[PDB]
């Protein structure tokens, strides 16, 4: 009896009153159908992953997180790397190191079939830091890496989703050399598609807003982009604001349309990973931020976008999540293999 759960994976350990055992090492999970809370082991548990940056659930239901080693682990290693872990969930539940990649930050993690893609981000190339266009592909099956076709532009803090076995990279930061009185980077409203059978990136229809730190989810092969920081149109230096905008993309038709705006402007997680997932044809935003300060506690509330009714519903308030988390993921889980909520 497996069911699809919203897993709010993070290594934050605060904000949950725990009398008999420590929930500081557990991550909040939510069944939106039964409205029941579960807990899964956080990636840091034991000698695991110190920092979580992003994650994916691959086609075969494997839960993947990518991040950085703890300072203790770094101190015993010669090189700093992107560290990729996978959750193991068959009565012996744990996080295991899967594979490592050349260090980057603010990259996006994609997945198609049995492959992982590390996309863009900031890297150190010839002892200089720059936003990159490079895309590294990891084959789980062959346990090796291949540099594939690069992005058509340098991107950081962008998002990626998969629809019908293609990657769609969305928004983010990109260098600009058009205007000498503008910051070095501008926000992007661009949408790029990667076709793995062709190893080729193409430019698709753009977003109405240039943006970053927004929610993403896929419902019935359409992309939902919600909230974020940005500005209408191409970013030419105009002021940036928190958005309630919902933009929905259809790949087959290559067009965007608006959705019902969110109840309030909302930012995704500070990792720029998604705070939203899709369960049974409905979209769930699991918490979010109303401002961009580093000290704001995440809103401990779960919103639903019912795309059929075409409206927003409050599903749950004051949920038992930590003060932050690092990536919202949906996977088929057997909730008997998970940790119950605290007895209080």
C-alpha positions as MATLAB code, in Angstrom:
seq = 'XXXXXXXXXXXXXXXXXXXXXXXXXXXXXXXXXXXXXXXXXXXXXXXXXXXXXXXXXXXXXXXXXXXXXXXXXXXXXXXXXXXXXXXXXXXXXXXXXXXXXXXXXXXXXXXXXXXXXXXXXXXXXXXXXXXXXXXXXXXXXXXXXXXXXXXXXXXXXXXXXXXXXXXXXXXXXXXXXXXXXXXXXXXXXXXXXXXXXXXXXXXXXXXXXXXXXXXXXXXXXXXXXXXXXXXXXXXXXXXXXXXXXXXXXXXXXXXXXXXXXXXXXXXXXXXXXXXXXXXXXXXXXXXXXXXXXXXXXXXXXXXXXXXXXXXXXXXXXXXXXXXXXXXXXXXXXXXXXXXXXXXX';
ca = [
       0.000    0.000    0.000;
       2.238    2.847   -1.186;
       0.885    6.380   -1.407;
       2.277    9.602   -2.859;
       3.677   11.860   -0.146;
       4.960   15.414   -0.119;
       8.457   15.105    1.381;
       9.818   18.399    2.717;
      13.470   17.368    2.885;
      15.808   19.580    4.895;
      18.586   19.541    7.453;
      17.125   22.318    9.630;
      16.580   20.997   13.167;
      14.495   23.728   14.844;
      10.861   24.389   15.597;
       9.363   21.027   16.618;
       8.669   20.296   20.305;
       9.890   16.706   20.794;
       9.511   15.143   24.236;
      10.543   11.472   23.835;
      12.809   11.408   20.742;
      14.637   14.006   18.647;
      12.910   15.242   15.481;
      15.849   17.544   14.730;
      17.094   14.715   12.485;
      13.760   14.111   10.720;
      12.015   15.838    7.814;
       8.321   16.758    7.627;
       6.151   14.778    5.184;
       2.482   15.177    4.351;
      -0.218   13.035    2.781;
      -2.582   15.643    1.286;
      -5.323   13.051    0.681;
      -5.571   11.786    4.278;
      -4.169   15.094    5.674;
      -1.775   13.080    7.868;
       1.793   14.053    8.798;
       4.737   11.632    8.680;
       8.474   12.093    9.164;
      11.357   10.749    7.102;
      15.020   10.671    8.078;
      16.827   13.867    7.082;
      19.868   13.468    4.792;
      22.246   14.583    7.563;
      21.266   11.698    9.874;
      24.330    9.816   11.068;
      27.377   10.430    8.882;
      25.226   11.655    5.978;
      24.832   14.849    3.943;
      25.662   18.041    5.833;
      23.877   20.498    3.533;
      21.033   19.866    1.091;
      20.751   22.136   -1.926;
      18.247   20.387   -4.167;
      16.747   17.064   -5.090;
      14.679   15.115   -7.583;
      12.534   12.010   -7.630;
      13.551    9.937  -10.616;
      11.215    8.022  -12.904;
      11.660    4.772  -10.953;
      10.644    6.533   -7.666;
      14.243    6.866   -6.377;
      14.593    9.886   -4.066;
      17.758   11.910   -4.832;
      19.235   14.894   -2.969;
      22.331   16.879   -3.907;
      24.363   19.083   -1.633;
      27.641   19.741    0.147;
      29.671   17.758    2.657;
      29.799   18.795    6.292;
      32.837   20.788    7.380;
      33.964   17.713    9.351;
      33.862   15.573    6.188;
      35.512   18.327    4.107;
      38.400   18.528    6.596;
      39.203   14.845    5.901;
      38.910   15.214    2.099;
      41.295   16.779   -0.390;
      38.641   18.188   -2.756;
      35.293   19.882   -2.298;
      32.495   18.384   -4.388;
      28.823   18.362   -5.148;
      27.653   15.348   -3.113;
      24.658   13.334   -4.344;
      22.789   10.964   -1.992;
      19.904    8.562   -2.487;
      17.304    7.423    0.018;
      16.913    3.690    0.580;
      13.417    2.652    1.716;
      12.765   -1.101    2.086;
      12.627   -1.793    5.831;
      16.291   -0.778    6.098;
      15.868    2.966    5.626;
      18.927    5.204    5.197;
      20.605    7.779    2.949;
      23.580    6.535    0.928;
      26.177    8.399   -1.085;
      25.462    7.806   -4.773;
      28.032    9.859   -6.678;
      30.024   13.096   -6.722;
      30.512   15.956   -9.151;
      32.901   18.868   -9.630;
      31.898   21.504   -7.085;
      29.278   24.102   -8.048;
      26.656   26.238   -6.326;
      23.262   27.537   -7.475;
      22.968   24.788  -10.129;
      19.767   22.918  -10.981;
      19.338   19.135  -10.740;
      17.333   17.440  -13.467;
      16.510   13.836  -14.190;
      15.299   11.845  -17.220;
      14.887    8.065  -17.214;
      17.933    6.714  -15.284;
      20.050    9.870  -15.598;
      20.827   12.912  -13.451;
      21.746   16.309  -14.901;
      23.735   18.987  -13.075;
      22.881   22.194  -14.929;
      24.555   25.587  -14.807;
      25.385   27.279  -11.528;
      28.536   29.088  -10.449;
      31.833   27.214  -10.800;
      35.552   27.853  -10.414;
      37.100   27.534  -13.895;
      40.851   28.274  -14.205;
      40.830   29.806  -10.694;
      38.029   32.282  -11.593;
      34.398   32.139  -10.450;
      31.726   32.501  -13.136;
      28.159   31.441  -13.861;
      28.436   28.475  -16.196;
      26.509   27.035  -19.115;
      27.824   23.531  -18.559;
      25.646   20.450  -18.108;
      27.064   17.250  -16.577;
      25.029   14.045  -16.999;
      25.275   11.132  -14.545;
      24.137    7.655  -15.619;
      22.932    5.684  -12.593;
      23.073    2.535  -14.723;
      26.687    2.941  -15.853;
      27.889    4.875  -12.771;
      29.738    7.483  -14.824;
      29.594   11.099  -15.989;
      29.474   12.856  -19.346;
      29.548   16.546  -20.245;
      26.573   17.052  -22.595;
      25.575   20.020  -24.759;
      25.858   23.292  -22.789;
      23.082   25.715  -22.030;
      22.688   28.474  -24.657;
      23.427   30.995  -21.903;
      25.062   31.106  -18.503;
      22.518   30.423  -15.768;
      22.461   30.291  -11.986;
      19.599   30.075   -9.468;
      17.391   28.686  -12.261;
      14.939   25.805  -11.891;
      14.525   22.616  -13.937;
      11.636   20.158  -14.390;
      11.089   17.207  -16.715;
       8.047   16.892  -18.985;
       7.698   13.926  -21.362;
      11.378   12.982  -21.012;
      12.736   16.441  -21.791;
      14.263   19.023  -19.453;
      12.760   22.496  -19.068;
      15.041   25.074  -17.428;
      13.275   28.140  -16.080;
      14.256   31.654  -15.045;
      17.301   32.307  -12.896;
      20.243   34.733  -13.008;
      22.402   35.442  -16.103;
      25.278   37.889  -16.836;
      24.479   41.056  -18.760;
      26.797   43.379  -20.683;
      24.092   45.485  -22.383;
      23.923   48.407  -19.925;
      26.907   49.825  -17.972;
      24.663   51.215  -15.200;
      23.077   47.842  -14.395;
      24.271   45.117  -12.035;
      26.490   42.372  -13.531;
      23.593   39.881  -13.549;
      19.951   40.140  -14.617;
      16.985   37.910  -13.976;
      15.831   35.689  -16.832;
      12.312   34.989  -18.101;
      13.623   32.445  -20.597;
      12.562   28.808  -20.927;
      15.025   26.300  -22.386;
      14.240   22.726  -23.445;
      16.824   19.932  -23.525;
      16.101   17.005  -25.825;
      18.367   14.091  -24.767;
      17.774   12.061  -27.932;
      19.169   15.055  -29.861;
      21.555   16.305  -27.135;
      20.260   19.748  -28.062;
      18.944   22.779  -26.180;
      16.338   25.038  -27.735;
      14.734   28.313  -26.703;
      11.024   28.012  -25.989;
       8.335   30.607  -25.377;
       9.358   32.969  -22.565;
       7.677   33.665  -19.259;
       5.755   36.905  -18.694;
       7.996   37.652  -15.693;
      11.745   37.333  -15.246;
      12.186   35.695  -11.891;
      14.026   33.497   -9.421;
      13.217   31.690   -6.147;
       9.798   30.571   -7.433;
       7.819   27.347   -6.922;
       7.627   24.686   -9.619;
       5.469   21.586  -10.090;
       4.301   19.454  -13.015;
       0.616   18.492  -13.288;
      -0.500   16.476  -16.322;
       2.578   17.401  -18.359;
       2.170   21.151  -17.776;
       4.624   23.284  -15.784;
       3.320   25.434  -12.941;
       5.565   28.343  -11.934;
       4.377   30.181   -8.861;
       5.563   33.140   -6.853;
       9.212   34.140   -6.714;
      11.173   37.391   -6.935;
      11.074   39.168  -10.269;
       9.750   41.824  -12.601;
       7.455   42.025  -15.620;
       9.212   41.440  -18.930;
      12.921   41.333  -19.682;
      15.051   42.480  -16.736;
      16.651   45.806  -17.678;
      17.259   46.941  -14.090;
      13.733   47.810  -12.981;
      12.834   47.201   -9.348;
      12.200   43.589   -8.284;
       9.270   42.517   -6.135;
       7.803   39.418   -4.540;
       5.232   37.888   -6.872;
       1.873   36.212   -6.542;
       1.963   35.406  -10.259;
       1.131   31.886  -11.421;
       2.308   31.026  -14.933;
       1.432   27.690  -16.547;
       3.404   26.308  -19.491;
       2.195   23.786  -22.075;
       5.139   22.093  -23.876;
       3.199   20.558  -26.771;
       1.641   23.926  -27.612;
       4.687   25.931  -26.472;
       2.688   28.643  -24.746;
       2.225   30.203  -21.324;
      -1.049   31.199  -19.651;
      -1.838   32.762  -16.305;
      -3.303   30.901  -13.404;
      -5.159   32.216  -10.392;
      -2.771   34.396   -8.400;
      -1.549   33.106   -5.079;
      -3.305   34.313   -1.893;
      -0.188   36.411   -1.187;
       3.218   36.901   -2.815;
       5.300   33.872   -1.843;
       8.935   32.867   -2.244;
      10.132   29.291   -2.579;
      12.957   27.906   -0.414;
      16.282   29.752    0.037;
      18.049   27.006   -1.947;
      15.784   28.107   -4.852;
      14.542   24.542   -4.847;
      10.810   24.068   -5.152;
       8.488   24.293   -2.164;
       5.681   22.693   -4.190;
       4.704   19.262   -5.489;
       1.828   17.569   -7.296;
      -0.297   14.734   -5.833;
      -3.178   13.117   -7.754;
      -3.605   16.020  -10.141;
      -3.493   18.788   -7.516;
      -0.687   21.217   -6.680;
       0.551   21.650   -3.087;
       2.707   24.524   -1.837;
       4.309   23.315    1.403;
       5.197   26.527    3.160;
       7.029   29.526    1.825;
       8.407   32.940    2.658;
       6.788   36.367    2.413;
      10.098   38.215    2.284;
      13.705   37.608    1.334;
      15.359   38.119    4.729;
      17.565   35.249    5.893;
      15.898   35.212    9.327;
      12.237   34.770    8.342;
      10.695   31.542    9.648;
       8.976   29.573    6.889;
       5.190   29.895    6.858;
       4.046   26.567    8.311;
       1.017   26.212    6.076;
       0.028   24.087    3.087;
      -1.845   25.594    0.128;
      -3.577   23.706   -2.689;
      -4.025   24.890   -6.260;
      -6.845   22.802   -7.644;
      -6.331   23.337  -11.403;
      -9.700   21.765  -12.188;
     -11.766   23.987   -9.913;
      -9.110   26.592  -10.904;
      -8.756   28.011   -7.410;
      -6.584   28.072   -4.305;
      -7.501   26.216   -1.116;
      -5.886   26.341    2.312;
      -5.278   22.681    3.166;
      -3.454   22.880    6.479;
      -2.170   25.503    8.894;
       0.385   25.361   11.696;
       1.849   22.145   10.288;
       4.665   20.469   12.182;
       7.481   21.467    9.855;
      10.872   22.806   10.878;
      11.732   26.502   10.491;
      12.981   25.741    6.964;
      13.662   22.870    4.582;
      15.621   22.459    1.390;
      13.554   20.749   -1.343;
       9.957   19.543   -1.644;
       9.735   16.141   -3.362;
       6.849   13.800   -4.162;
       7.506   10.061   -4.075;
       5.461    6.882   -3.648;
       6.065    5.743   -0.043;
       4.727    3.075    2.266;
       3.886    5.252    5.295;
       4.374    2.280    7.650;
       8.084    2.638    6.808;
       8.036    6.250    8.087;
       8.259    7.962   11.461;
       4.962    8.931   13.168;
       4.305   12.514   14.327;
       5.269   13.473   17.891;
       3.124   12.315   20.819;
       2.046   15.634   22.296;
];
